[PDB]
Design an enzyme around this catalytic site. Structure first.
Site, PDB file in Angstrom:
ATOM      1  N   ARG A  92      44.132  39.303  35.330  1.00 34.82           N
ATOM      2  CA  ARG A  92      45.377  38.606  35.018  1.00 34.82           C
ATOM      3  C   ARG A  92      45.158  37.654  33.859  1.00 34.82           C
ATOM      4  O   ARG A  92      44.181  36.894  33.874  1.00 34.82           O
ATOM      5  CB  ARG A  92      45.840  37.759  36.202  1.00 34.82           C
ATOM      6  N   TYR A 133      45.302  46.186  34.212  1.00 34.38           N
ATOM      7  CA  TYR A 133      44.529  45.518  35.259  1.00 34.38           C
ATOM      8  C   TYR A 133      45.379  44.751  36.274  1.00 34.38           C
ATOM      9  O   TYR A 133      46.230  43.939  35.899  1.00 34.38           O
ATOM     10  CB  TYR A 133      43.505  44.542  34.643  1.00 34.38           C
ATOM     11  N   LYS A 193      51.949  40.234  42.032  1.00 35.31           N
ATOM     12  CA  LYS A 193      52.255  38.885  41.532  1.00 35.31           C
ATOM     13  C   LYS A 193      53.635  38.820  40.909  1.00 35.31           C
ATOM     14  O   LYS A 193      54.407  37.913  41.209  1.00 35.31           O
ATOM     15  CB  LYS A 193      51.218  38.435  40.515  1.00 35.31           C
ATOM     16  N   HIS A 197      51.700  32.273  47.862  1.00 33.38           N
ATOM     17  CA  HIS A 197      50.357  32.784  47.608  1.00 33.38           C
ATOM     18  C   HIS A 197      49.496  32.432  48.822  1.00 33.38           C
ATOM     19  O   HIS A 197      48.552  31.619  48.733  1.00 33.38           O
ATOM     20  CB  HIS A 197      49.836  32.135  46.318  1.00 33.38           C
ATOM     21  N   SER A 206      43.243  31.423  43.517  1.00 34.79           N
ATOM     22  CA  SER A 206      42.377  32.577  43.297  1.00 34.79           C
ATOM     23  C   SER A 206      40.922  32.107  43.274  1.00 34.79           C
ATOM     24  O   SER A 206      40.628  31.004  42.842  1.00 34.79           O
ATOM     25  CB  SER A 206      42.744  33.294  41.991  1.00 34.79           C
ATOM     26  N   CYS A 231      39.089  31.099  45.727  1.00 34.71           N
ATOM     27  CA  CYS A 231      38.842  29.967  46.649  1.00 34.71           C
ATOM     28  C   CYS A 231      38.863  30.341  48.140  1.00 34.71           C
ATOM     29  O   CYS A 231      38.914  29.450  48.997  1.00 34.71           O
ATOM     30  CB  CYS A 231      39.805  28.808  46.359  1.00 34.71           C
ATOM     31  N   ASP A 277      46.800  37.589  50.869  1.00 37.77           N
ATOM     32  CA  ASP A 277      47.203  37.160  49.512  1.00 37.77           C
ATOM     33  C   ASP A 277      48.663  36.692  49.332  1.00 37.77           C
ATOM     34  O   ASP A 277      48.903  35.664  48.701  1.00 37.77           O
ATOM     35  CB  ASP A 277      46.902  38.277  48.500  1.00 37.77           C
ATOM     36  N   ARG A 281      37.017  44.103  41.652  1.00 42.25           N
ATOM     37  CA  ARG A 281      37.859  44.184  42.826  1.00 42.25           C
ATOM     38  C   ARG A 281      37.632  45.466  43.598  1.00 42.25           C
ATOM     39  O   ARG A 281      37.219  46.481  43.033  1.00 42.25           O
ATOM     40  CB  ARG A 281      39.330  44.141  42.388  1.00 42.25           C
TER      41      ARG A 281
HETATM   42  N1  LIG Z   1      31.154  27.541  50.345  1.00 40.28           N
HETATM   43  C1  LIG Z   1      32.096  28.412  50.767  1.00 40.28           C
HETATM   44  N2  LIG Z   1      32.555  29.313  49.865  1.00 40.28           N
HETATM   45  C2  LIG Z   1      33.514  30.212  50.218  1.00 40.28           C
HETATM   46  C3  LIG Z   1      34.050  30.217  51.583  1.00 40.28           C
HETATM   47  N3  LIG Z   1      34.968  31.196  51.650  1.00 40.28           N
HETATM   48  C4  LIG Z   1      35.009  31.774  50.423  1.00 40.28           C
HETATM   49  N4  LIG Z   1      34.149  31.182  49.589  1.00 40.28           N
HETATM   50  C5  LIG Z   1      33.908  31.522  48.175  1.00 40.28           C
HETATM   51  O1  LIG Z   1      35.099  32.014  47.544  1.00 40.28           O
HETATM   52  C6  LIG Z   1      34.783  33.154  46.743  1.00 40.28           C
HETATM   53  C7  LIG Z   1      35.482  34.369  47.327  1.00 40.28           C
HETATM   54  O2  LIG Z   1      36.882  34.095  47.445  1.00 40.28           O
HETATM   55  P1  LIG Z   1      37.949  35.077  46.753  1.00 40.28           P
HETATM   56  O3  LIG Z   1      38.066  36.302  47.628  1.00 40.28           O
HETATM   57  O4  LIG Z   1      37.490  35.222  45.323  1.00 40.28           O
HETATM   58  O5  LIG Z   1      39.310  34.197  46.769  1.00 40.28           O
HETATM   59  P2  LIG Z   1      40.824  34.703  47.022  1.00 40.28           P
HETATM   60  O6  LIG Z   1      41.575  33.477  47.469  1.00 40.28           O
HETATM   61  O7  LIG Z   1      40.897  35.882  47.946  1.00 40.28           O
HETATM   62  O8  LIG Z   1      41.252  35.122  45.501  1.00 40.28           O
HETATM   63  P3  LIG Z   1      42.487  36.113  45.051  1.00 40.28           P
HETATM   64  O9  LIG Z   1      42.266  37.393  45.806  1.00 40.28           O
HETATM   65  O10 LIG Z   1      42.229  36.275  43.574  1.00 40.28           O
HETATM   66  O11 LIG Z   1      43.764  35.382  45.397  1.00 40.28           O
HETATM   67  C8  LIG Z   1      33.265  33.267  46.760  1.00 40.28           C
HETATM   68  O12 LIG Z   1      32.740  32.477  45.697  1.00 40.28           O
HETATM   69  C9  LIG Z   1      32.869  32.618  48.061  1.00 40.28           C
HETATM   70  O13 LIG Z   1      31.550  32.064  48.031  1.00 40.28           O
HETATM   71  C10 LIG Z   1      33.499  29.201  52.499  1.00 40.28           C
HETATM   72  O14 LIG Z   1      33.924  29.160  53.666  1.00 40.28           O
HETATM   73  N5  LIG Z   1      32.558  28.356  52.042  1.00 40.28           N
HETATM   74  O1  LIG Z   2      44.509  36.281  40.854  1.00 41.93           O
HETATM   75  C1  LIG Z   2      44.900  36.500  42.016  1.00 41.93           C
HETATM   76  O2  LIG Z   2      45.374  35.579  42.729  1.00 41.93           O
HETATM   77  C2  LIG Z   2      44.814  37.857  42.562  1.00 41.93           C
HETATM   78  O3  LIG Z   2      45.113  38.036  43.751  1.00 41.93           O
HETATM   79  C3  LIG Z   2      44.357  39.011  41.675  1.00 41.93           C
HETATM   80  S1  LIG Z   2      45.588  39.700  40.757  1.00 41.93           S
HETATM   81  O4  LIG Z   2      46.461  40.432  41.627  1.00 41.93           O
HETATM   82  O5  LIG Z   2      46.300  38.682  40.050  1.00 41.93           O
HETATM   83  O6  LIG Z   2      44.907  40.671  39.642  1.00 41.93           O
HETATM   84 MN   LIG Z   3      41.787  37.818  47.839  1.00 38.67          MN
HETATM   85 MN   LIG Z   4      45.870  36.076  44.734  1.00 39.39          MN
END
Ligand SMILES: Nc1nc2c(ncn2[C@@H]2O[C@H](COP(=O)(O)OP(=O)(O)OP(=O)(O)O)[C@@H](O)[C@H]2O)c(=O)[nH]1
Ligand SMILES: O=C(O)C(=O)CS(=O)(=O)O
Ligand SMILES: [Mn+2]
Ligand SMILES: [Mn+2]
Ligand SMILES: [Mn+2]
Ligand code: NA
Length: 611
Positions: free
Chosen positions: A85, A233, A242, A262, A284, A286, A309, A403
């Site tokens: 994105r 992408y 989104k 979100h 994202s 987090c 998501d 992904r």
């Molecule tokens: N320290 C710590 N890190 C975490 C935890 N849960 C997730 N993470 C971190 O978050 C990242 C993975 O989260 P993502 O799947 O990228 O986040 P998301 O919110 O699903 O992102 P989008 O799919 O893009 O919306 C990795 O860096 C993990 O280490 C936790 O409980 N503790």
């Molecule tokens: O960036 C985000 O929050 C995502 O979930 C990935 S995408 O759908 O924006 O490519």
């Molecule tokens: Mn996710």
């Molecule tokens: Mn997302």
């Protein structure tokens, strides 16, 4: 009806029929066929055969590779210019700028990017005419939400990318049944082109058609249109996710009295077998996906996933906050996904799953940073850049935003109500991000109005950036009006307002190590929240809200976790925090900032001053 052929593209239809399509869907397809000049038109039916043949075609073309270790899994590798994105090339078109973003005092808004109708029309005309020459235009009929849910909305995506077609089959409900369920109803018009008409002017990198220079992801909410050019992408090209389900939907939501957010959605069950659903908004990268399909470390507890998501939520006639996952799959970040960080993901992605920008093992499997599965001696690794990769290379083997795209139905802990047309009843909403200092592990808002302020005040590491409600890249309209809309939920008839929490998994001591182990151990935080929703006296009042009482958190089997540093609240930190929130809201929201949010800021500032 015609002097010559009309705008009849019937001759180029290679699957389905223009006569079968609803009248307004026919116009959308034919009008854009006339504009984009595809060689062929393919009307998607959503069947396994269509899907299988499409994957085999992409395989022939070098667009995807089969991962022969797994059951029907595939790998796509992109042009390194088209990997995520892009917010900077993402715009919303309205008559008045102020309907899209508040007018910032400083001059540059962080809350969205507006473009005028006039400027967009020029951009459109410099991109789309003839853009699909030599390519097939796929017509993807899709439902966001379970087919025929009262909360579901239908879209039609036109695209010249087979990868988008395949990915949309996983991430939405798509096919003939959607067209049948649609009838002559309204639908969101989704137009997408990779922006590389044949013959190719510029050379193709990694068999990945894209056009970075002209990349533009546009939303025209008053026309019910999403128009996306140049990126293949994720959030740029999978227009249901989104663009539809956050940006267009958030605006619809405001107009109709619901919410498009979100947020992950999960069901949690305690040792007594008592069940609640929680929604959580983190930015994202987090950890939404880790939380949504958590394997809880605490004995007797059970987490089940509804979505990871997007959440569409609406208070029903009983006043319960009903949530649906409008998606049909998970488009999750791959790196970090191990058996320890996320075992339920590892099991979902074994079959029928498309991987993008991860590394490939010599025996036909997938690899990425933090997979925590060592390989046999002799097994070598092809990077996401299609080159040999040793563990002592300077680069990572998978791209950081690489992904998986996997069906939600395959998740071992998918919630039995994840497709119930009425949605699941939300009893708590969690906000959170990455804060290395200052912010405790968990706290609870003092009221709905305070909770809305907590959402509005969210910040997260990328440099700690502002990301209110985890929606900074996704607001479909004026953020100030979004806050007003949230606050308005307090005046609904019989509405049972969820408890609002804020969490922080990422607090660190002064050597930079995580003070909390997290992941599965976050079930200990969810336990507390569960009890607080039940009315338990497990809370101590602080300036920022309620925290757990001493010994209210179950820390059995953690040992020497530092509760002192992890729950510490510093006056000096929070004085700075409120000042920075004040200035941000004043600059970025100004005249559209609701009174009640200002009041909460003044109240928080006052409570901190009394420390
Ligand atoms: N320290 C710590 N890190 C975490 C935890 N849960 C997730 N993470 C971190 O978050 C990242 C993975 O989260 P993502 O799947 O990228 O986040 P998301 O919110 O699903 O992102 P989008 O799919 O893009 O919306 C990795 O860096 C993990 O280490 C936790 O409980 N503790
Ligand atoms: O960036 C985000 O929050 C995502 O979930 C990935 S995408 O759908 O924006 O490519
Ligand atoms: Mn996710
Ligand atoms: Mn997302
Ligand atoms: Mn060919
Ligand atoms: Na490729």
């Amino acid at each position: 009806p015609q002097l010559h052929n009309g705008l009849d593209f019937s001759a180029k239809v290679i699957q389905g029929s223009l006569d079968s399509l609803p009248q307004e869907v026919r116009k959308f397809v034919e009008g854009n066929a006339q504009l984009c000049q595809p060689e062929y038109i393919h009307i998607c039916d959503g069947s396994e055969e269509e899907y299988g043949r499409l994957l085999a075609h992409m395989q022939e073309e070098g667009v995807i590779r089969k991962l022969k270790k797994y059951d029907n899994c595939w790998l796509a590798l992109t042009d390194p210019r088209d990997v995520a994105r892009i917010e900077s090339k993402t715009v919303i078109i309205t008559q008045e700028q102020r309907d899209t973003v508040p007018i910032p005092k400083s001059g540059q808004s962080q809350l969205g990017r507006w473009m005028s109708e006039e400027d967009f029309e020029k951009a459109f005309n410099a991109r789309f005419p003839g853009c699909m020459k030599g390519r097939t235009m796929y017509v993807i009929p899709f439902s966001m939400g379970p087919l025929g849910s009262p909360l579901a909305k239908i879209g039609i995506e036109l695209t010249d990318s087979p990868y988008v077609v395949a990915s949309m089959r996983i991430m939405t409900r798509m096919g003939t049944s959607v067209l049948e369920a649609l009838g002559d109803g309204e639908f969101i018009k989704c137009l997408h082109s990779v922006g590389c008409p044949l013959p190719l002017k510029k050379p193709l990198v990694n068999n990945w058609a894209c056009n970075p220079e002209l990349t533009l992801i546009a939303h025209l909410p008053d026309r019910r249109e999403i128009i996306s050019f140049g990126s293949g992408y994720g959030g740029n090209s999978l227009l249901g996710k989104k663009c539809f389900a956050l940006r267009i939907a958030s605006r619809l939501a405001k107009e109709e009295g619901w919410l498009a957010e979100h947020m992950l959605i999960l069901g949690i069950t305690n040792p007594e077998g008592k069940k609640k659903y929680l929604a959580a908004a983190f930015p994202s990268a987090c950890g939404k996906t880790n939380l949504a399909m958590m394997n809880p470390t605490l004995p007797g507890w059970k987490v089940e996933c509804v979505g990871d998501d997007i959440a569409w939520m609406k208070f029903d006639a009983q006043g319960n906050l009903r949530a649906i996952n409008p998606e049909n799959g998970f488009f999750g970040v791959a790196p970090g996904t191990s058996v320890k960080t996320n075992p339920n993901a590892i099991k979902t992605i074994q079959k029928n799953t498309i991987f993008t920008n991860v590394a490939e093992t010599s025996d036909g499997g997938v690899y990425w940073e933090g997979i925590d599965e060592p390989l046999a001696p002799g097994v070598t690794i092809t990077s996401w850049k299609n080159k040999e990769w040793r563990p002592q290379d300077e680069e990572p083997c998978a791209h950081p935003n690489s992904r998986f795209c996997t069906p939600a139905s395959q998740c071992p802990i998918i919630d039995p109500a994840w497709e119930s047309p009425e949605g699941v009843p939300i009893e708590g909403i969690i906000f959170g991000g990455r804060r290395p200092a200052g912010v405790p592990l968990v706290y609870e808002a003092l009221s709905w109005q305070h909770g809305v302020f907590v959402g509005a005040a969210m910040r997260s590491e990328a440099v700690i950036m502002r990301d209110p409600f985890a929606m900074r890249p996704f607001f479909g309209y004026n953020f100030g009006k979004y806050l007003a809309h949230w606050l308005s939920m307090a005046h609904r008839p019989a509405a049972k307002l969820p408890k609002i929490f804020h969490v922080n998994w990422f607090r660190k001591d002064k050597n930079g190590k995580f003070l909390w182990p997290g992941f599965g151990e976050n079930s200990r935080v969810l336990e507390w929240m569960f009890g607080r929703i039940e009315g338990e006296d497990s809370a101590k009042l602080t300036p920022i809200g309620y925290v757990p009482k001493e010994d209210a958190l179950n820390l059995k089997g953690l040992g020497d976790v530092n509760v002192e540093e992890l729950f510490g609240i510093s006056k000096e930190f929070w004085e700075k925090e409120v000042e920075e929130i004040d200035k941000y809201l004043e600059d970025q929201v100004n005249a559209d900032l609701p009174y009640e949010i200002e009041r909460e800021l003044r109240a928080l500032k006052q409570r901190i001053s009394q420390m």
